């Protein structure tokens, strides 16, 4: 194989240290290889002399580490600077020390030695990204089935402690960048590292799931710079709505980032994720208003043109949902989302109500079944308008705190169902002694007790049902046992409106004071997830979007038949990358000097 | 003109409400009232978050409920008043129900039975999930938001009162 | 960036003067309340004849204005002294 032939002598030295560390008894790395189920090229297809002698080759180890970070994580290692013909290139020795320090760094996590990993982290380059990848792979490798066993007990534990050390270390280099310059930190965190398949570092944080790194305000400054198209003029919601409503009267007058420069400024404005988000919010608002005017107005004897507009609108919504499901992510990724399932049930509710309308357009009963089917579409579509509230700062943690509080809501429903079913069966049996069972007795159980919790204590209607003829409201009755409905009603409203609802109040106060900060850190993770979702959105809004899918069909005309697809990517300057690397080395040396002074300045030390 | 006197009293009712509301601006000299005003002005963002949460439930149940009790009706202004009117006062407590039984034209001795439209006895179920979403979820989220809001900015409201 | 830490730590030193100012008021409230009320109604002639609580309000020192000796001076400035 030519992959082992292109491996240099330092890769054989790291493979010799892996074979030397794996020859010890009760080693976790031999249990890691024996539970890997991979090939010697690193593919997971599950020759034997190459699988015994060269099983600890560094490309197979790097593929096991790229699987161990995430499902879609990948690394890229170039050994072609290790030839002797590139010795006269400038900086090839520095990239050789960077690639060898990264490989010995990943071996140092793989042997769980902390100070050697600190030394290869300090002499390495791209320190923040490698610290995030380390902290993720050591925190996942501590909780792994290959490290199960008592004799690898404390190396299960304390290396996880060391994993949290790298997480704290990574935050402080970001804090050292936020100690130095915010604009150089924003140029740092938009830089795509070429060894990690040209991915920016906040996507490395989201794939590494570092919630402590993503809750930092410098990362939120980078994410809010990745909102609004990196344009520092229109940052308000109403200012972006006034810029979207009047594009020609605002965008020459706005600040910058000829006719081609104004066209590049308008193309930078409409490729913002905030502009596509307010276009999707405006398209969903026009959808809910036009389906509200459809369902409130009476349906005609024939098909109306507004029903054809709703058919084309939800046909474009179903085409965008099938394009997000099939050709974008996968079925298991799209089925895990809550709002995708709400979009699928409003597609099914509209098509059930439209098929109930279009089966018999002349029947008024079929129009009654169509409006009763479409009332679910009204409730689910206005409830799906709440999914655009995650971009607001004051609304998103209230949604995550309500989703945390719904377990206490379900505990209150499971407590109140006891009191409601017991008082409802006892009360409806007690006011009607001589009555046969029917459906209306079950409606009389399940109906009135509920609305006596929420406040309407129907009482006259209970005095009329009880047939009590006294001037006192429960007196002179026919049945002598029929004047105990108050007493059951009295102990029911003491059990409902003075016990369980105020237990909710105490449960919501303890629930909100528990998970307020965790709902804030989950809002920061949903903020970068919403910015990454609307960065990959189509530029058109929703009833144009199927026509934009026709433009994706024009990409199909660039795909296989014409095969004339031309694409390019922006290449950064080498002086700006060298300034970012010198900025990273100066901020890392300043943070390790300040952290050594802060560790020596503690009371216990 | 008596109609101009009716327009003058309907214009002056705003002057009554704004003048009695401007009488609250003399409460800042009191020690026990001024931090309650600064804590209410801090708490009005959580009030506006509760209005933005409740407008979803009110507009959705109002359009679905007024469309469901009147299937065969043309659109007018009174359908929009029937959306925006009754759902609100069902949060604050008056669950109009007889009036909904009279509007639903159900002739049974049971309060939602023997109706003309067979789909018209689902207004309770939407009313049931609406009062669980309003009077048991969002208002008590205000309670938790006001407790965390007051325990946040009580001392800052005191220093702003100084 | 090169005036970075002189951005930061002097702000730390700024809070030091704020704490220092409160304690001299506390030393005045250690000594005599009537001499502190005669102190804080005195108009300094180098600052266009302004009393020191107006210097605190123009200086926006909320830690100085939340002190009870300053509230004794403000409630002496209520009720006509
Ligand atoms: C204290 C409780 C839990 C124990 C059991 C008490 C029950 C079985 C007793 C206590 C008082 C009783 C009631 C007292 C008087 C009357 C009037 C009579 O014309 C019909 C029966 C009726 C209405 C009784 C029904 C049964 C009753 C409710
Ligand atoms: C269960 C615990 C909490 C206490 C038990 C209280 C019950 C058994 C008592 C309390 C008040 C009582 C009622 C008081 C008065 C009357 C009117 C009389 O014409 C028939 C019995 C009747 C309707 C009683 C039935 C039993 C009653 C409901
Ligand atoms: C502080 C709280 C517990 C107040 C006490 C409430 C109790 C004692 C009151 C509230 C409502 C009352 C009932 C109201 C009406 C009737 C019907 C009458 O024909 C017999 C008595 C009876 C059944 C009463 C019994 C006592 C009663 C149950
Ligand atoms: C579980 C939900 C969300 C999925 C969709 C269910 C909807 C479309 C179905 C479920 C039960 C259905 C109702 C069941 C029975 C009747 C009686 C019939 O004479 C008129 C239609 C009517 C009133 C149906 C209307 C549509 C209906 C409400
Ligand atoms: C949406 C989730 C929470 C559950 C769905 C419940 C819905 C689909 C169910 C629950 C109870 C059902 C109702 C129960 C009984 C009747 C009376 C019948 O003569 C017509 C259908 C009607 C009016 C049903 C319509 C559908 C209904 C409202
Ligand atoms: C603990 C809580 C959830 C109690 C459960 C409340 C539910 C199950 C109850 C409350 C009110 C009830 C409704 C009241 C009236 C009617 C009209 C009738 O023609 C069909 C059933 C229907 C539509 C009931 C269905 C069940 C219902 C929605």
- Phi and psi, residue B73, nearest 5°: -150, 135
Find the residue in A nearest to B144 (Cα): A509
Residue B63: which of A292, A443, A516 has the nearest Cβ?
A292
Q: How far is CA C22 from CA C37, C64, C66, C68, in A?
A: 15, 6, 10, 11
- What distance in Å separates the CA atoms of residue A277 and residue A226, rounded to the nearest whole number? 13
Contact between residue A319 and residue A546 where contact means Cβ atoms under 8 Å apart: yes
Residues of chain C contacting B162 with CB distance shorter than 8 Å = 62, 65-66, 70-71
Using a 10 angstrom Cβ sphere, with 0-12 exposed, 13-18 middle and 19 or more buried, the burial of residue B12 is: exposed
User: A231: which DSSP letter?
Assistant: -
Residues of chain B contacting C66 with CB distance shorter than 8 Å = 158-159, 162
For A490, the enclosing helix (H) or strand (E) is helix A485-495
Question: Which are the contacts of A98, defined by CB distance < 8 A and separation ≥ 6?
Answer: A124, A125, A126
- For residue B132, the CA-to-ligand 6 centroid distance in Å is 12
What is the three-class DSSP state of A199? strand
Residues counted in chain B: 162
User: How many other CB atoms are there within 10 angstroms of residue A450's CB atom?
Assistant: 19
Contact between residue A449 and residue A427 where contact means Cβ atoms under 8 Å apart: yes
Q: Do A180 and C8 touch (CB under 8 A)?
A: no
Which chains would you list as touching B if contact means 3+ CB atom pairs under 8 Å? Answer: A, C
Ligand at minimal distance from the CA of B125 is 6
Contact between residue A191 and residue A200 where contact means Cβ atoms under 8 Å apart: yes
How near does any CA of chain A get to the CA of C16, in Å? 21
Is the shortest distance between the CB of A470 and ligand 2 below 6 Å?
no
For A109, the enclosing helix (H) or strand (E) is helix A92-110
Experimental method: cryo-EM
Q: How many CB pairs under 8 A join B and C?
A: 11
Q: Do B148 and A516 touch (CB under 8 A)?
A: yes
- What distance in Å separates the CA atoms of residue A506 and residue B140, rounded to the nearest whole number? 10
Chain C positions touching chain B (beta carbons under 8 Å): 62-63, 65-66, 70-71
Q: Which two tokens mark A573?
A: 């300057």
Q: Which residues of A are annotated as a binding site for Ca(2+)?
A: 122, 124, 321, 324, 340, 343, 585
Q: Do A184 and C1 touch (CB under 8 A)?
A: yes
- Phi and psi, residue A193, nearest 5°: -75, 130
- For residue A442, the CA-to-ligand 6 centroid distance in Å is 9
- What distance in Å separates the CA atoms of residue A124 and residue A596, rounded to the nearest whole number? 19
Q: Do B159 and C65 touch (CB under 8 A)?
A: yes
Question: Which are the contacts of A128, defined by CB distance < 8 A and separation ≥ 6?
Answer: A170, A173, A174, A188, A201, A584
- What distance in Å separates the CA atoms of residue A473 and residue A469, rounded to the nearest whole number? 8
Q: DSSP per residue over A145-162, as a string?
A: GGG-SSTTSHHHHHHHHH
Residue B110: which of A374, A440, A455 has the nearest Cβ?
A440
User: How many other CB atoms are there within 10 angstroms of residue A517's CB atom?
Assistant: 11
What is the three-class DSSP state of C44? strand
Radius of gyration of chain C (CA): 15
H helices of B1-122, in order, are 2-22, 34-69, 77-84, 86-89, 98-103
Q: Report the residue of B28, B29, B35, B162 to disrupt the C interface, i.e. the one with the largest count of C CBs within 10 Å.
A: B162
Q: Which residues of A are annotated as a binding site for Mg(2+)?
A: 121-122, 124, 321, 324, 340, 343, 585
User: A196: which DSSP letter?
Assistant: G
Long-range pairs, A167-171, Cβ under 8 A, ≥24:
A167/A131, A167/A135, A167/A139, A167/A210, A167/A212, A167/A213, A169/A131, A169/A595, A170/A128, A170/A131, A170/A132, A170/A135, A170/A210, A170/A213, A171/A212, A171/A213, A171/A216
What is the three-class DSSP state of A510? helix
Q: Which two tokens mark A43?
A: 């593919």
- What distance in Å separates the CA atoms of residue A164 and residue A584, rounded to the nearest whole number? 21
Residues of chain B contacting A502 with CB distance shorter than 8 Å = none
- What distance in Å separates the CA atoms of residue A524 and residue A214, rounded to the nearest whole number? 6
Contact between residue B83 and residue B66 where contact means Cβ atoms under 8 Å apart: yes
H helices of A182-334, in order, are 182-189, 201-207, 211-214, 217-226, 237-245, 259-269, 273-296, 305-324, 331-334
Which chains would you list as touching C if contact means 3+ CB atom pairs under 8 Å? Answer: A, B
- What distance in Å separates the CA atoms of residue B153 and residue B160, rounded to the nearest whole number? 10
List residues bridging with A193 in a β-sheet.
A199
List residues bridging with C50 in a β-sheet.
C44
Residues of chain B contacting A395 with CB distance shorter than 8 Å = 49, 52-53
Contact between residue A423 and residue A452 where contact means Cβ atoms under 8 Å apart: no
- What distance in Å separates the CA atoms of residue A491 and residue A484, rounded to the nearest whole number? 11
**CA geometry: angle B36, B41, B42, nearest 5 deg:** 95
Contact between residue B92 and residue B54 where contact means Cβ atoms under 8 Å apart: no
Q: How far is CA B32 from CA A307, A338, B27, B35, in A?
A: 60, 47, 9, 7
Q: Do B93 and A513 touch (CB under 8 A)?
A: no
Is the shortest distance between the CB of A244 and ligand 4 below 6 Å?
no
- What distance in Å separates the CA atoms of residue C38 and residue A356, rounded to the nearest whole number? 87
Contact between residue A342 and residue A383 where contact means Cβ atoms under 8 Å apart: yes
In Å, how far from its chain's centre is CA A526? 5
Q: Which two tokens mark A560?
A: 């296989």
- Residues A320-332 as b or e (16 or more Cβ within 10 Å = b): bbebbbeeeeeee
3-state helix, strand, coil in chain B (%, to 5): 75, 0, 25
Q: How far is CA A463 from CA A431, A456, A474, B81, B85, in A?
A: 10, 14, 7, 33, 30
User: A194: which DSSP letter?
Assistant: G
User: How many other CB atoms are there within 10 angstroms of residue A137's CB atom?
Assistant: 23
3-state helix, strand, coil in chain A (%, to 5): 70, 0, 30
- What distance in Å separates the CA atoms of residue C30 and residue C68, rounded to the nearest whole number? 12
Chain B positions touching chain C (beta carbons under 8 Å): 158-160, 162
Is the shortest distance between the CB of A494 and ligand 2 below 6 Å?
no
Using a 10 angstrom Cβ sphere, with 0-12 exposed, 13-18 middle and 19 or more buried, the burial of residue A569 is: exposed
What is the three-class DSSP state of A482? coil
Q: How far is CA A454 from CA A417, A457, B62, in A?
A: 14, 8, 19
- What distance in Å separates the CA atoms of residue C53 and residue C62, rounded to the nearest whole number? 11
What is the three-class DSSP state of C42? coil
Q: Which of A464, A527, A590 is nearest to A224 (CA)?
A: A527
Residues counted in chain C: 81
Residues of chain A contacting B61 with CB distance shorter than 8 Å = 379
Query: Which protein residue's CA is at the shortest distance from atom 16 of ligand 1?
Result: A481
Q: Which of A189, A181, A231, A185 is nearest to A206 (CA)?
A: A189
Q: How many CB pairs under 8 A join A and B?
A: 130
Q: Report the residue of C53, C61, C62, C75 to disrupt the B interface, i.e. the one with the largest count of B CBs within 10 Å.
A: C62
Is the shortest distance between the CB of A484 and ligand 2 below 6 Å?
yes
Query: Which protein residue's CA is at the shortest distance from atom 4 of ligand 3?
Result: A490
Half-sphere exposure of A315 (CA within 13 A, CB side): 8
Resolution for this PDB entry, in angstroms: 3.7
Contact between residue C24 and residue C16 where contact means Cβ atoms under 8 Å apart: no
Q: Do B158 and C66 touch (CB under 8 A)?
A: yes
Residues of chain A contacting C5 with CB distance shorter than 8 Å = 179
Ligand at minimal distance from the CA of A451 is 6
Find the residue in B nearest to C61 (Cα): B159
What is the three-class DSSP state of A307? helix
Question: Which are the contacts of A141, defined by CB distance < 8 A and separation ≥ 6?
Answer: A68, A109, A147, A159
Q: Which of A226, A105, A223, A249 is nearest to A166 (CA)?
A: A105
Is the shortest distance between the CB of B98 and ligand 4 below 6 Å?
no
Q: Which two tokens mark A283?
A: 């398209």
Q: Which of A53, A229, A33, A216 is nearest to A128 (CA)?
A: A216
Q: Label each residue of A206-224 as H, E or C.
A: HHCCCHHHHCCHHHHHHHH
- What distance in Å separates the CA atoms of residue A96 and residue A81, rounded to the nearest whole number? 7
For ligand 5, residues with CB inside 6 Å are: B 118, 121-122, 125
Residues of chain A contacting C4 with CB distance shorter than 8 Å = 179-181
Q: Which residues of A are annotated as a binding site?
A: 121-122, 124, 321, 324, 340, 343, 585
Sign of CA dihedral A231, A233, A235, A240: negative
Query: Which protein residue's CA is at the shortest distance from atom 27 of ligand 2?
Result: A484
Which chains would you list as touching A if contact means 3+ CB atom pairs under 8 Å? Answer: B, C
- Phi and psi, residue A435, nearest 5°: -150, 135
**Breaks in chain A, after residue numbers (C to N greater than 2.5 Å):** 46, 257
Residues of chain C contacting A183 with CB distance shorter than 8 Å = none
- For residue B122, the CA-to-ligand 5 centroid distance in Å is 6
- For residue A373, the CA-to-ligand 4 centroid distance in Å is 7
Q: Which of A156, A157, A103, A106 is nearest to A131 (CA)?
A: A106
Query: Which protein residue's CA is at the shortest distance from atom 5 of ligand 2?
Result: A487
What is the three-class DSSP state of A129? helix
Q: How far apart are the first and last CA of chain A?
A: 54
Contact between residue A228 and residue A272 where contact means Cβ atoms under 8 Å apart: yes
User: B25: which DSSP letter?
Assistant: G
Find the residue in A nearest to B96 (Cα): A456
- For residue C27, the CA-to-ligand 4 centroid distance in Å is 79
From A481, A482, A487, mutation site for ligand 2 pocket: most ligand atoms within 8 A of C-beta: A487
- What distance in Å separates the CA atoms of residue B75 and residue A476, rounded to the nearest whole number? 50
- What distance in Å separates the CA atoms of residue A167 and residue A136, rounded to the nearest whole number? 9
Q: Which of A406, A403, A356 is nearest to A377 (CA)?
A: A356
Strand segments, DSSP code E, in A452-583 are none
Q: How far apart are the first and last CA of chain B?
A: 52
Q: DSSP per residue over C47-79, as a string?
A: GTSB-HHHHHHHTT-HHHHTSHHHHHHHHHHTT
User: A415: which DSSP letter?
Assistant: H
Q: Do A454 and B141 touch (CB under 8 A)?
A: no
What is the three-class DSSP state of A193? strand
Q: Do A504 and B122 touch (CB under 8 A)?
A: no
For ligand 3, residues with CB inside 6 Å are: A 474-475, 483-484, 486-487, 490
Question: Which are the contacts of A549, defined by CB distance < 8 A and separation ≥ 6?
Answer: A319, A320, A323, A538
Residues counted in chain A: 605
Q: Which two tokens mark A574?
A: 């080498």
């Amino acid at each position: 194989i030519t992959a082992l032939d292109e491996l240099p002598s330092f890769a054989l030295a790291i493979e010799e240290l892996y074979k030397r560390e794996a020859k010890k008894p009760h080693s976790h790395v031999q249990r890691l290889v024996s539970l890997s189920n991979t090939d010697v090229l690193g593919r997971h297809y599950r020759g034997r002399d190459l699988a015994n002698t060269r099983a600890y080759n560094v490309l197979r180890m790097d593929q096991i580490f790229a699987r161990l970070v995430s499902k879609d994580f990948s690394v890229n290692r170039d050994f072609t600077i290790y030839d002797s013909k590139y010795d006269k290139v400038p900086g090839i020795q520095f990239r050789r020390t960077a690639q060898a320090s990264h490989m010995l760094f990943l071996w140092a996590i793989c042997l769980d030695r902390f100070r050697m990993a600190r030394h290869f982290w300090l002499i390495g380059d791209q320190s923040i990204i490698n610290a995030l990848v380390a902290s993720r792979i050591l925190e996942r490798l501590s909780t792994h089935r290959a490290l199960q066993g008592p004799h690898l007990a404390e190396e299960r534990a304390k290396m996880q402690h060391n994993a949290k050390k790298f997480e704290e270390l990574a935050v402080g280099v970001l804090g050292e960048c936020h100690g130095s310059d915010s604009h150089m930190a924003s140029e740092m965190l938009h830089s795509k590292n070429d060894m990690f398949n040209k991915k920016n570092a906040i996507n490395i944080a989201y794939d590494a799931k570092s919630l402590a790194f993503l809750s930092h305000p410098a990362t939120q400054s980078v994410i809010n710079a990745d909102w609004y198209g990196h344009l520092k003029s229109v940052t308000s919601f109403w200012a972006v709505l006034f810029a979207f409503f009047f594009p020609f009267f605002v965008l020459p007058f706005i600040n910058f980032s000829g006719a081609h420069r104004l066209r590049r400024k308008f193309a930078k404005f409409y490729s913002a994720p905030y502009t596509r988000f307010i276009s999707d919010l405006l398209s969903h608002f026009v959808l809910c208003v036009v389906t509200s005017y459809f369902v409130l107005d009476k349906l005609e004897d024939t098909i109306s043109a507004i029903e054809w507009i709703l058919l084309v609108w939800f046909v474009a919504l179903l085409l965008e949902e099938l394009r997000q499901m099939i050709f974008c992510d996968g079925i298991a990724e799209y089925i895990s989302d809550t709002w995708n399932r709400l979009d699928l049930i409003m597609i099914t509710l509209f098509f059930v109500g439209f098929f109930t309308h279009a089966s018999d357009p002349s029947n008024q009963d079929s129009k009654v079944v169509s409006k009763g089917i479409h009332a679910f579409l009204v409730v689910v579509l206005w409830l799906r308008f709440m999914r655009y509230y995650a971009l607001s700062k004051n609304l998103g943690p209230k949604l995550i705190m309500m989703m945390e509080m719904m377990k206490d809501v379900s505990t209150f429903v499971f407590l109140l169902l006891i009191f409601l079913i017991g008082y409802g069966v006892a009360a409806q049996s007690l006011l009607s002694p001589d009555e046969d069972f029917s459906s209306r007795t079950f409606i009389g159980v399940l109906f009135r007790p509920y609305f006596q919790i929420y406040g309407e204590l129907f009482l006259d209607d209970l005095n009329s049902e009880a047939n009590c003829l006294g001037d006192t409201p429960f007196t002179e009755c026919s049945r002598e046992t029929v004047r105990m409905v108050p007493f059951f009603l009295a102990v029911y409203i003491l059990g409902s409106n003075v016990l369980l609802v105020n237990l909710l109040i105490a449960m919501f106060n303890d629930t909100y004071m528990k998970v307020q900060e965790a709902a804030e850190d989950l809002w920061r993770k949903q903020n970068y997830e919403l910015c990454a979702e609307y960065k990959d959105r189509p530029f058109l809004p929703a009833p144009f979007i199927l026509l934009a899918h026709v433009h994706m069909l024009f990409m199909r005309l660039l795909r296989l038949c014409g095969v004339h697809t031309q694409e390019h990517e922006k290449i950064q300057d080498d002086e700006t990358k060298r300034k970012i690397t010198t900025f990273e080395e100066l901020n890392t040396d300043k943070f390790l000097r300040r952290w050594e002074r802060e560790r020596q300045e503690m009371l216990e030390a």
